[PDB]
Amino acid sequence: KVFGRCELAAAMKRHGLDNYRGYSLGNWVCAAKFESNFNTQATNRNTDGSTDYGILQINSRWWCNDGRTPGSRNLCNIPCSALLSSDITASVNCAKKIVSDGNGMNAWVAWRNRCKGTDVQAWIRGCRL
Protein backbone atom coordinates (compact mmCIF):
# COMPACT_ATOMS: atom_id res chain seq x y z
CA LYS A 1 0.00 0.00 0.00
CA VAL A 2 1.23 3.54 -0.80
CA PHE A 3 -0.08 5.83 1.95
CA GLY A 4 -0.95 9.44 1.58
CA ARG A 5 0.97 11.79 3.89
CA CYS A 6 -2.04 12.70 6.13
CA GLU A 7 -3.42 9.12 5.91
CA LEU A 8 -0.12 7.77 7.30
CA ALA A 9 0.06 10.52 9.98
CA ALA A 10 -3.43 9.46 11.14
CA ALA A 11 -2.56 5.72 11.14
CA MET A 12 0.68 6.33 13.09
CA LYS A 13 -1.22 8.47 15.62
CA ARG A 14 -3.92 5.78 16.05
CA HIS A 15 -1.09 3.24 16.75
CA GLY A 16 0.51 5.48 19.44
CA LEU A 17 3.63 6.84 17.68
CA ASP A 18 2.90 10.61 18.23
CA ASN A 19 5.46 11.73 20.85
CA TYR A 20 6.59 8.08 21.39
CA ARG A 21 9.97 8.30 23.25
CA GLY A 22 9.53 12.11 22.77
CA TYR A 23 9.47 12.04 18.93
CA SER A 24 6.63 14.15 17.49
CA LEU A 25 4.47 12.66 14.72
CA GLY A 26 6.24 14.73 12.00
CA ASN A 27 9.53 12.92 12.81
CA TRP A 28 7.89 9.53 12.07
CA VAL A 29 6.18 10.81 8.87
CA CYS A 30 9.46 12.37 7.63
CA ALA A 31 11.39 9.13 8.36
CA ALA A 32 8.75 7.09 6.43
CA LYS A 33 8.84 9.50 3.46
CA PHE A 34 12.60 9.16 3.00
CA GLU A 35 12.88 5.45 3.95
CA SER A 36 10.02 4.12 1.71
CA ASN A 37 8.16 7.04 -0.04
CA PHE A 38 5.26 5.80 2.14
CA ASN A 39 5.19 2.35 0.36
CA THR A 40 4.63 -0.56 2.78
CA GLN A 41 6.09 -2.97 0.16
CA ALA A 42 9.55 -1.23 -0.02
CA THR A 43 12.56 -3.59 0.31
CA ASN A 44 16.26 -2.83 -0.06
CA ARG A 45 19.27 -5.23 0.14
CA ASN A 46 22.34 -4.09 2.15
CA THR A 47 25.96 -5.02 1.14
CA ASP A 48 26.20 -7.22 4.34
CA GLY A 49 23.35 -9.43 2.93
CA SER A 50 20.68 -8.09 5.36
CA THR A 51 17.45 -6.57 3.92
CA ASP A 52 15.38 -3.56 4.99
CA TYR A 53 11.56 -4.01 4.96
CA GLY A 54 8.48 -1.80 4.84
CA ILE A 55 7.52 1.79 5.45
CA LEU A 56 10.33 2.30 8.05
CA GLN A 57 12.92 0.03 6.31
CA ILE A 58 13.51 -2.20 9.38
CA ASN A 59 16.60 -4.39 8.99
CA SER A 60 16.78 -8.22 9.19
CA ARG A 61 20.25 -8.10 10.88
CA TRP A 62 18.52 -7.40 14.26
CA TRP A 63 14.76 -6.99 14.11
CA CYS A 64 12.93 -9.57 11.94
CA ASN A 65 13.44 -13.07 10.50
CA ASP A 66 13.75 -13.52 6.69
CA GLY A 67 15.71 -16.85 6.90
CA ARG A 68 18.56 -15.47 4.68
CA THR A 69 20.54 -13.22 7.07
CA PRO A 70 23.17 -15.45 8.75
CA GLY A 71 23.94 -14.88 12.45
CA SER A 72 21.10 -12.31 12.64
CA ARG A 73 18.60 -11.79 15.44
CA ASN A 74 14.79 -11.39 15.36
CA LEU A 75 14.28 -8.99 18.27
CA CYS A 76 10.68 -7.97 17.14
CA ASN A 77 9.79 -11.73 16.91
CA ILE A 78 8.14 -11.41 13.47
CA PRO A 79 8.78 -12.61 9.93
CA CYS A 80 10.16 -9.68 7.91
CA SER A 81 7.17 -10.19 5.50
CA ALA A 82 4.85 -8.84 8.28
CA LEU A 83 6.59 -5.46 7.78
CA LEU A 84 5.22 -5.26 4.17
CA SER A 85 1.49 -5.45 5.17
CA SER A 86 -1.09 -2.73 4.27
CA ASP A 87 -1.70 -2.87 8.08
CA ILE A 88 1.19 -0.93 9.71
CA THR A 89 0.72 -2.50 13.21
CA ALA A 90 3.79 -4.83 12.93
CA SER A 91 6.02 -1.98 11.58
CA VAL A 92 4.85 0.42 14.33
CA ASN A 93 5.23 -2.14 17.17
CA CYS A 94 8.76 -3.03 15.93
CA ALA A 95 9.72 0.68 15.50
CA LYS A 96 8.72 1.29 19.17
CA LYS A 97 11.31 -1.38 20.20
CA ILE A 98 13.99 0.11 17.90
CA VAL A 99 13.55 3.72 19.10
CA SER A 100 13.71 2.45 22.74
CA ASP A 101 17.12 0.73 22.03
CA GLY A 102 19.37 3.66 23.16
CA ASN A 103 20.10 5.87 20.04
CA GLY A 104 16.47 7.01 19.55
CA MET A 105 15.59 7.78 15.94
CA ASN A 106 19.32 7.94 14.92
CA ALA A 107 18.79 4.18 14.24
CA TRP A 108 17.24 5.40 10.97
CA VAL A 109 20.12 6.88 8.95
CA ALA A 110 17.64 8.72 6.59
CA TRP A 111 16.02 10.37 9.67
CA ARG A 112 19.43 11.53 10.94
CA ASN A 113 20.53 12.84 7.53
CA ARG A 114 17.22 14.26 6.18
CA CYS A 115 14.79 14.85 9.10
CA LYS A 116 16.76 15.56 12.28
CA GLY A 117 16.81 19.28 13.14
CA THR A 118 14.47 20.26 10.25
CA ASP A 119 10.93 21.67 10.46
CA VAL A 120 9.32 18.18 10.75
CA GLN A 121 5.93 19.63 11.78
CA ALA A 122 5.57 20.53 8.04
CA TRP A 123 4.97 16.78 7.42
CA ILE A 124 1.68 16.87 9.39
CA ARG A 125 0.63 20.46 8.37
CA GLY A 126 -2.98 20.60 7.13
CA CYS A 127 -3.86 17.09 8.34
CA ARG A 128 -7.09 16.33 10.27
CA LEU A 129 -5.58 14.48 13.32
Residues near 109 by beta carbon (within 8 Å), at least 6 away in sequence: none
Q: On the CB side of 108, how many CA atoms lie within 13 Å of its CA?
A: 31
Tell me if residue 66 is catalytic: no
Closest distance to Na ion from the beta carbon of 66 (Å): 6
Q: What are the φ/ψ torsions at residue 20 (nearest 5 degrees)?
A: -65, 125
Q: What is the residue-wise DSSP string for 8-26?
A: HHHHHHHTT-TTBTTB-HH
Question: Is 48 annotated in some ligand binding site?
Answer: no
Tell me if residue 7 is catalytic: no
Using the rule CB under 5 A, is 57 a contact of Na ion? Answer: no
Nearer to Na ion, 58 or 124 (CB): 58
Residues belonging to the chain: 129
Instruction: Give, as ranges, the residues between 65 and 104 that touch Cl ion (CB under 5 A).
Output: 65, 67, 69, 72-74, 79, 87-88, 104
Binding residues: 101
Q: Which residues here bind Cl ion, judged by CB under 5 A?
A: 5, 11, 24, 26, 65, 67, 69, 72-74, 79, 87-88, 104, 120-121
Catalytic residues: 35, 52
